[PDB]
Each structure stands twice: as structure tokens, then as C-alpha cells.
From a paper:
The zinc metalloprotease angiotensin I‐converting enzyme (ACE;EC 3.4.15.1) is well‐known for its crucial role in blood pressure regulation and fluid homeostasis via the renin–angiotensin–aldosterone system (RAAS), where it catalyzes the hydrolysis of angiotensin I (Ang I) to the vasopressor angiotensin II (Ang II; Ehlers & Riordan, 1989). The somatic isoform of ACE (sACE) is a 1,277‐amino acid type‐I integral membrane protein with a short C‐terminal cytoplasmic tail. Each sACE molecule is composed of two homologous domains (N‐ and C‐domains) separated by a short linker region and each domain harbors a catalytic site with a HEMGH zinc‐binding motif (Wei, 1991). sACE is related to the carboxypeptidase ACE2 which, in addition to its role in the RAAS (Turner & Nalivaeva, 2022), acts as the functional receptor for the severe acute respiratory syndrome (SARS) coronavirus (Li et al, 2003) and SARS coronavirus 2 (SARS‐CoV‐2; Hoffmann et al, 2020). Here, we report the first cryo‐EM structures of full‐length, glycosylated, soluble sACE (sACES1211).
Although the C‐domains were unresolved due to high flexibility, the N‐domains resolved to a high resolution and allowed for the identification of the dimerization interface. B, C The local refinement map of the interacting N‐domains was resolved to a higher resolution, and the model showed wide active site clefts, and contact between the interdomain linker and subdomain II regions at the interface. The dimeric sACES1211 cryo‐EM structure shows a bridge formed between glycans on N82 of the two protomers. Apart from the glycan‐glycan bridge, the interface is further formed between residues of subdomain II of each N‐domain, specifically the helix of 456–471, Cloop‐2, and Cloop‐3. Equivalent interactions occur for both domains due to C2 symmetry. Residue Y465 is at the centre of the interface and forms hydrogen bonds to K469 and D462, and sandwich pi‐stacking with Y465. Y597 on Cloop‐3 interacts with F461 via T‐shaped pi‐stacking and hydrogen bonds with the N460 backbone carbonyl. However, the interface had an area of 1,054.76 Å2 and scored a favorable solvation free energy gain (ΔiG) of −7.29 kcal/mol upon formation of the complex (excluding the contribution of satisfied hydrogen bonds and salt bridges across the interface). Dimerization does not appear to cause large‐scale changes in the apo N‐domain conformation, since the monomer and dimer cryo‐EM N‐domain structures compare very well (0.65 Å RMSD). While the monomeric N‐domain showed zinc coordinated by H361 and H365, both dimer N‐domain active sites showed a rotamer flip of H361 away from the zinc, with metal coordination only via the H365 sidechain.
Residue numbers in the entry: 1 to 608
Write the structure that this text describes.
Amino acid sequence: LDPGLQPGNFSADEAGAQLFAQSYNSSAEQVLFQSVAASWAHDTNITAENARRQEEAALLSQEFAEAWGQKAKELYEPIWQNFTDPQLRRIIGAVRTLGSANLPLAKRQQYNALLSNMSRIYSTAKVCLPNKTATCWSLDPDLTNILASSRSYAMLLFAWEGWHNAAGIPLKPLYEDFTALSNEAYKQDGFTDTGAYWRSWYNSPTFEDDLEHLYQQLEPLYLNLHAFVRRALHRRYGDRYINLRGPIPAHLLGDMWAQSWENIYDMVVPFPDKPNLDVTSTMLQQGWNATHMFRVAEEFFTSLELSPMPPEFWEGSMLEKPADGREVVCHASAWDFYNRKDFRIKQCTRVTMDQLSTVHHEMGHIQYYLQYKDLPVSLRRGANPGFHEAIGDVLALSVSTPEHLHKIGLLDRVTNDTESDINYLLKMALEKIAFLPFGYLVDQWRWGVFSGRTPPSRYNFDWWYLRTKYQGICPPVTRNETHFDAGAKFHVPNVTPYIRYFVSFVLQFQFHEALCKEAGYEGPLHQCDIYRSTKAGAKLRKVLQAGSSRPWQEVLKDMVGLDALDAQPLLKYFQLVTQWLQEQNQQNGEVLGWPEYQWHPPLPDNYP
Ligand SMILES: *[C@@H]1O[C@H](CO[C@@H]2O[C@@H](C)[C@@H](O)[C@@H](O)[C@@H]2O)[C@@H](O[C@@H]2O[C@H](CO)[C@@H](O[C@@H]3O[C@H](CO[C@H]4O[C@H](CO)[C@@H](O)[C@H](O)[C@@H]4O[C@@H]4O[C@H](CO)[C@@H](O)[C@H](O)[C@H]4NC(C)=O)[C@@H](O)[C@H](O[C@H]4O[C@H](CO)[C@@H](O)[C@H](O)[C@@H]4O)[C@@H]3O)[C@H](O)[C@H]2NC(C)=O)[C@H](O)[C@H]1NC(C)=O
Ligand SMILES: *[C@@H]1O[C@H](CO)[C@@H](O[C@@H]2O[C@H](CO)[C@@H](O[C@@H]3O[C@H](CO[C@H]4O[C@H](CO)[C@@H](O)[C@H](O)[C@@H]4O[C@@H]4O[C@H](CO)[C@@H](O)[C@H](O)[C@H]4NC(C)=O)[C@@H](O)[C@H](O)[C@@H]3O)[C@H](O)[C@H]2NC(C)=O)[C@H](O)[C@H]1NC(C)=O
Ligand SMILES: *[C@@H]1O[C@H](CO)[C@@H](O[C@@H]2O[C@H](CO)[C@@H](O[C@@H]3O[C@H](CO)[C@@H](O)[C@H](O[C@H]4O[C@H](CO)[C@@H](O)[C@H](O)[C@@H]4O)[C@@H]3O)[C@H](O)[C@H]2NC(C)=O)[C@H](O)[C@H]1NC(C)=O
Ligand SMILES: *[C@@H]1O[C@H](CO)[C@@H](O[C@@H]2O[C@H](CO)[C@@H](O[C@@H]3O[C@H](CO)[C@@H](O)[C@H](O)[C@@H]3O)[C@H](O)[C@H]2NC(C)=O)[C@H](O)[C@H]1NC(C)=O
Ligand SMILES: *[C@@H]1O[C@H](CO)[C@@H](O[C@@H]2O[C@H](CO)[C@@H](O[C@@H]3O[C@H](CO)[C@@H](O)[C@H](O)[C@@H]3O)[C@H](O)[C@H]2NC(C)=O)[C@H](O)[C@H]1NC(C)=O
Ligand SMILES: *[C@@H]1O[C@H](CO)[C@@H](O[C@@H]2O[C@H](CO)[C@@H](O[C@@H]3O[C@H](CO)[C@@H](O)[C@H](O)[C@@H]3O)[C@H](O)[C@H]2NC(C)=O)[C@H](O)[C@H]1NC(C)=O
Ligand SMILES: *[C@@H]1O[C@H](CO)[C@@H](O[C@@H]2O[C@H](CO)[C@@H](O)[C@H](O)[C@H]2NC(C)=O)[C@H](O)[C@H]1NC(C)=O
Ligand SMILES: *[C@@H]1O[C@H](CO)[C@@H](O)[C@H](O)[C@H]1NC(C)=O
Ligand SMILES: [Zn+2]
């Protein structure tokens, strides 16, 4: 520990704690920058040297969070709740959280080693065909691509069976040990369990109830969608393997976790005679290039009179693919270095209509970072953890439209045909609405484990209960408590909350509606754009400047006017497809929901 990074002495006063907050701030951006710089380099190009620098940076960060966290508890754990500023209470409350650093070394060294071991066995999971094969598969590319692409039911089944079997089972013992150790650490931090810690972020005493009220508002839309898809699969696979009343076999939905079904959009799409618009042909013809695209993205924000990207951003960012042959993580990401001056993007840009949209949300994050850089570092995070991605997405929504592309000049004429825009809303529904029930059930399920209400003998039972209850899916081959299908997801062994994403996808439209309402727009909400609309920016800026200083429920209210989440705006956005599906279901006599829930298909005749 460098002494300039090691805390000093502070009194039990607020007057002291204000000085503690100030000292933590000044040290914090000096450590976090050094940490993120290393992590930036390692990700900007892989080298074992940079991986080492990445590893050392990780340790240096934790060592810093520890050295300060321990004193924050020692001096202010008896007090912090008392302090007059809600901003300061947030500052100290964050520092005062220690997480795993509560565990004594013996447990601590098991804990880290245990968490790493889960990620290893998941990331390095494998499935092998039932021969003396030279070669096995892995989740990507082999499994993701066969599962999405092929539709011979047996082959599709085996791929799903192998994965949840191989990925889950060897996790089963580890995940229990994680659960015990996880809760024990937070107990000392001040939470009943890890689950009550995660819910602490949303600072809402009624949080879990709020979700069910939201989800109940979605269920008519989701059931409408689910019931529609279910019929389509019946056309494809046969009466033996689908029940037009029952739930859907989990592996037919084109995705290993059935969390988003878009790979059956090719099978289901409405109005097969219409195209789906691709503006790439203009963009290449215009001589658009990656470097230019961001200037369009910046144009948008400048058009809202949000802040332009500072010169440092253009000096630093890796907008283009590198000139070297060096290996790089191409997946696009946006970075804030807590050093106030320089913000950074990595995009690996390929000039296509899709990545044009993608750049806009990635720059959206940068605009978000730019606005709250003025806060003390402890607060420089989204108003709540799903709130940051929402401000990212509302931007991509607007520009994805044909309407905005015409103001970009990339589109020649607007073509207001509902058959086309239904195609667009429906694919987006198969992407994101299918995700809401899944995103909801996981963190209910994990809260069930962390609260203990799902003891280890029920890990798998409570999972499939939650799947059929919410997502309308059931397992394709009988699954029993030797298995552990909850582990087969990325976010579970990586102990990463999904609930942020669900909160975000609701805040997304709850903003978009409140912006389009403010931008003077009227008409079909998916045809709104806010570009050039200074009225939207000045209100949006008020959200971004707040960062996390001000409780999100108060900030959301200042933007939208509602003290809480609501899915009515989301239903407004999807309204056109909502109507269309209701017609199509009513025409087919399709039974919304899934009675005969106690059904799942027989096995293929010679399996395998
Ligand atoms: C990615 O795309 C970027 C943008 O490309 C341009 O725009 C897009 C939409 C497409 O249409 C592209 O085809 C198009 O090229 C590229 O940056 C641009 O690169 C080109 C070529 O390298 C640049 O063109 C050259 O610019 C010189 C400077 O011209 C400006 O400055 C003069 C003073 O030096 C001034 O007198 C001019 O009026 C001009 O001012 C610009 O005005 C327009 C509006 O009228 C603004 O939009 C600009 O921002 C203004 N820029 C400034 C600095 O004020 C010219 O001297 C030069 O002409 C000479 O060279 C050409 C060959 O290049 C000869 O053919 C010609 O006869 C003459 O001798 C030429 O115009 C362009 O300026 C760059 N953009 C900017 C903003 O500077 C990226 O390089 C590209 N990257 C990749 C990898 O593709
Ligand atoms: C969390 O902790 C950070 C870091 O300690 C605090 O930032 C510092 O806050 C103070 C108060 O706002 C700020 O002082 C003001 O800075 C303005 C710019 O001052 C710069 O120029 C003068 C000369 O004109 C220098 O004397 C200063 O040291 C500054 O120097 C420049 O700083 C930038 C930014 O880091 C750096 O990139 C440049 O390299 C450097 N210049 C050169 C030539 O190298 C003044 O206009 C103003 O009047 C005040 O002096 C101080 O500069 C901040 N430092 C940094 C590193 O950010 C945060 O305030 C704190 N958080 C909160 C919420 O308070
Ligand atoms: C990924 O990005 C990083 C940052 O841009 C980039 O880092 C550089 O990589 C090169 C090798 O490709 C490093 O060069 C050597 O590093 C070794 C130690 O690992 C040194 O022994 C070498 O010393 C000589 O060179 C020095 C100047 O670099 C001289 O001052 C010295 O006297 C010796 O003559 C040499 O430094 C370089 O150090 C790193 N730098 C950093 C900051 O990482 C890396 O190249 C990129 N990846 C790829 C594949 O290009
Ligand atoms: C932060 O506050 C602490 C506690 O008020 C200060 O700690 C004290 O620091 C002095 C030196 O400034 C230490 O002196 C040592 O005392 C022992 C005898 O106990 C002697 O054998 C050593 O040779 C040395 O003189 C003292 O131990 C230490 N005491 C405590 C309780 O921490 C500290 O000075 C303050 N920080 C700063 C930067 O001033
Ligand atoms: C994380 O997983 C790894 C791998 O399962 C665990 O490391 C393994 O630990 C065992 C002993 O605990 C090692 O087996 C022993 O090896 C020695 C020879 O080194 C042998 O004499 C013993 O009879 C026994 O076979 C095993 O080699 C070791 N593997 C690796 C790769 O290190 C680790 O303990 C797990 N940690 C947690 C927290 O789960
Ligand atoms: C939960 O369901 C699984 C199947 O999905 C059951 O596990 C299976 O049980 C049978 C009977 O023991 C195993 O067959 C045996 O395999 C061994 C080779 O491993 C072979 O030598 C025997 O002759 C016999 O064929 C089968 O392999 C096994 N599968 C797995 C993946 O373990 C399990 O019994 C069910 N849970 C409970 C509590 O019964
Ligand atoms: C910190 O907590 C204490 C205890 O809840 C508060 O002290 C009490 O304050 C009320 C009025 O605010 C008095 O009627 C009590 O007599 C006080 N009790 C004691 C033991 O002093 C204190 O006000 C809180 N501080 C803040 C800033 O809210
Ligand atoms: C598209 O045409 C319909 C015609 O009824 C109209 O109601 C709708 O508002 C048009 N789109 C926009 C963005 O105005
Ligand atoms: Zn994002």
C-alpha cells in the first residue's frame, strides 16, 4: 500500500467524514485510473505481459478498496446512517461496503478460489458427440450455431441435453459452497443475505413486489407472443413434440437458454413478402467510414446540445480495427477512466446499418460519463445499476428508425408501411420481450437460494418451477436434482445479477415516451425521433448530471413524472404488434397461457 493511497485519521464527526469523503475521492481516481489503464491496455490488445499488468491491477484495486473499506467500517459503521447529507450517506455507504473482504483469510482464499473455479468449469465446459470423436463441441461457436441453425429435433435436443448436463452437474457442488460463503460475508456488511444486498442497489423497500406488478402488466403481451410462437413451432416439428396448450420444450426456441428467440424469426416472420430495411448500401456508397460515423453520433448529441466528445476522446479511442495483426477483443465497449479528462471507446467498427445503431448507444454511455464526471468519484455510477444501460438504449431506439436515418440522409425516402414496421417491432419483441420473463425468473431464483428458501435439494426443482411459471417453458428430457440447470447460464456461475437488465428495459421506454412527449412528437411511438430536439436534451441532461447522487426514484420522477417503474409506456411502444398478435391468436383459437402445464414431449424414437 502506497502511503498516498492509505487513509489517514478522521473524527467521528460529519465534519470529519466530509474530509474523509474528500480524501477518498482524491486517492480513488488515482488508483482507479492506474487500474483501468492496465485493464484498457490488456483489452486493447492481448499480451501475457498485459494480462500480468491486468492481474496486478486487479489486486491493487481490491487492496485499495480494502484499506479504505476497513477504516470506513472501523470509524463510521456505527454512525454513517446518521449523517445529514444523503449524498454523503451515499458516499460513505459505498465505501463502507466490503463484500468478500469481510471474510478472514482462510475463507477469503477459498472464496476467491471458489468463484474462479466456477467460471473455469463453465467457460471451459464442453460437450462431446457419443462417439470416439476426434473433436468435441463448445458452447460457441459449435453449440450456439447448431442450436440456432439446425431444426432436426433430435440433433437440436442432444445439443441442449449435452450442454445443461455438462455445464450444470459439475457446478452443483460448487454453487452451494459459494452460496454459504457469499451470505456469510455480507452478513457482517449489514445484509440478511447476498440477495438482500443486490436488492439494496435499487433502494426500494418494496422492490420485489414492484417487479411482479410490472410483470403482470407484461404477461398479456408475453402470453400473446408466447402463444403465437408456440403455434408456429407446431407447424414445423409435428404434433408429437408440441402441445398447442402445453408449454414449449426449452430447446426448440432457437437459443441455448431460450432467453431470446430471434433465431426463429426466420421461421415465424410476419408478411414474408416485405423486406426488412438495410441502409448499408447507401452507407458504403456514401463513402462512410468508421471514423466518420462517430462524428455523426456526436452530431446527434451536439444537436441535443449535450456535450461534444472532448479532444482526448478522439486522441485515445480505438474506433477502427487496429493496423497491426495483433489480437484484440473486438466486442464493442465504452470506457470511463475516473481521471476526469479522458474517456475512451473500443468499437472494432464495421460500417453496417447494425453497427451504426450500435455505436449510438456506445457513445450514449460516453455522453453519460461526460455529464457526471463532476461528482465525487464514489457517486460516479448510474442512478441505479440498470439505469445506465437505459440511457444507453433510448438513443439507439430513436436512431434505429427509418425516420431518423432519413434525417441522417442515409435513407432515400420514408416508406410508411405497417407490414414493414410490424416486422421491425416483432423481431424486437422476439429479442427483448422474450428476455423479460427470463431475466425476471433468474434473480427471483437466486434470491430464493440466497434467502435459503431454495435449499440445495431444490436448486433444480425451483428452477424448472420458475421456468414453467413465468417463461412458459418445460424441460425436454426429465431433469432431477442431480442436475443443476441454473448453473448452465453465464450469469449464474459468474455471480452477475440479471435484474439490472430487466429494470433497464423498462426504464428504457419509460424514458423514451417521456422524451418523445417532451420532444413535441405525436403518432406511433416507434416512429418518434428526438434528433435536433433541444427540449429533450435539456431534460435528459438533468438525468445524466445526477449520476447516483440523487436516489433514482427521485430522478426518474423529475424526468418522467412517475415515482416508480411502469410498463404502460412499453405496452404503448409495442402496441401495433400487440394488436396484430391478438388478432392472429384469436383467428387460430390459440389458447393464451399454457394449461396442461404437466406435459413435456416424449423422446425421439431412436435417441440418439
Ligand atoms: C472518413 O470520412 C471522413 C469524411 O470524409 C468526407 O465526408 C464523408 C461524408 C464522405 O463524403 C467522404 O467521401 C468525404 O471525403 C474523412 O475525412 C475527410 O477526408 C477527406 C479526404 O482525405 C478530406 O477532404 C479534403 O479536405 C481538405 C481540407 O478541406 C477543408 O479545409 C480546407 C482548408 O484546408 C477548406 O478550404 C475546405 O473548404 C474544407 O473545409 C471543409 O468544409 C466542409 C463543408 O464545406 C466541412 O464539412 C469540413 O469539416 C471542412 N473542413 C475543414 C478542415 O474546415 C481539402 O483541401 C481536400 O481537397 C484537396 O485534396 C483532394 C484529395 O483529398 C483533391 O482531390 C482536391 O482537388 C484538393 O486538392 C479535400 O477536400 C475531408 O476534409 C476530411 N474531413 C474533414 C472533416 O476534414 C476520413 O479521412 C475518412 N477516413 C477513412 C478511413 O475513410
Ligand atoms: C476528487 O479529486 C479530484 C482530484 O484531486 C479533484 O479534482 C481537483 O479539483 C479542484 C477543484 O475543482 C481542481 O482545481 C481547479 O482546477 C481548475 C483547473 O486547474 C488546472 O490548471 C491550473 C493552472 O491554471 C493548475 O494549477 C491545476 O493544478 C490544474 O492543472 C491541470 O489539471 C488537469 C486536470 O487534472 C490536468 O489534466 C492538467 O494536466 C493540469 N495542467 C497542466 C498544465 O498539467 C482551475 O481552473 C480551478 O480554478 C481550480 O484550480 C483541481 O485541478 C482538480 N484536479 C484534478 C486532477 O482533477 C475533484 O475536485 C474531487 N472531486 C470533487 C467532487 O471535488
Ligand atoms: C499492446 O499495447 C501495448 C501498449 O501500447 C504494447 O506494449 C509494448 O509492447 C512491446 C513489445 O511488443 C514492449 O517492448 C519491449 O518490452 C520488453 C519487456 O516486456 C522490454 O524488455 C523491451 O525493452 C526495450 O525497449 C524499450 C522501449 O520499449 C527500451 O527503452 C529498452 O531500453 C529496451 O531497448 C521493450 O520495451 C513495450 O515495452 C510494451 N509497452 C507497454 C507500455 O506495454 C504492446 O506491444 C501491444 N501489443 C502488441 C502485440 O503490439
Ligand atoms: C493518526 O492518529 C494516530 C492515533 O491518534 C496517530 O498514531 C500515533 O502516531 C505516533 C507517531 O506520530 C506513534 O508514536 C509511536 O509511539 C510509540 C509508543 O506508543 C513509540 O514507541 C514509537 O517510537 C512512536 O513514537 C503512536 O504509536 C501512534 N499511536 C496510535 C494510537 O496510533 C498518528 O500519528 C496519526 N497520523 C498521523 C499522520 O499523524
Ligand atoms: C479448484 O479446482 C482445482 C481443480 O479441481 C483444485 O485444485 C486441485 O486440488 C487438488 C487437491 O485439493 C489437487 O489434487 C492433488 O494433487 C496432488 C499433486 O499436486 C496429489 O498428490 C494429491 O493426491 C491430489 O491428487 C489437484 O491437483 C488440484 N488441481 C489443480 C489444477 O490445481 C482447487 O482446490 C479448487 N479450489 C476450489 C476452491 O474449489
Ligand atoms: C437423474 O436423471 C439422470 C439421467 O438424466 C440419471 O442418471 C443416469 O442414471 C443411469 C442409471 O444409473 C446411468 O446409467 C448407467 O451409466 C453407467 C455409466 O455411467 C453404466 O455403467 C450403467 O450400466 C448404466 O448404463 C446414467 O449414466 C445416468 N446418467 C447420468 C448423466 O448420470 C439419474 O439417476 C437421475 N437422478 C436420480 C437421483 O436417479
Ligand atoms: C442521529 O441519530 C440520533 C439518534 O436517533 C439523533 O439524536 C436524537 O435526535 C432527536 C432529534 O433529532 C432528539 O430528540 C434525541 O434526543 C436525540 N438522541 C440522542 C441520543 O442524542 C440524531 O439527531 C441523529 N442525527 C441526524 C443528523 O439525524
Ligand atoms: C403512417 O401512416 C399512418 C396512416 O394512418 C399514420 O397514422 C401514421 O401517423 C404515419 N406515421 C407517422 C410517423 O406519422
Ligand atoms: Zn450498453
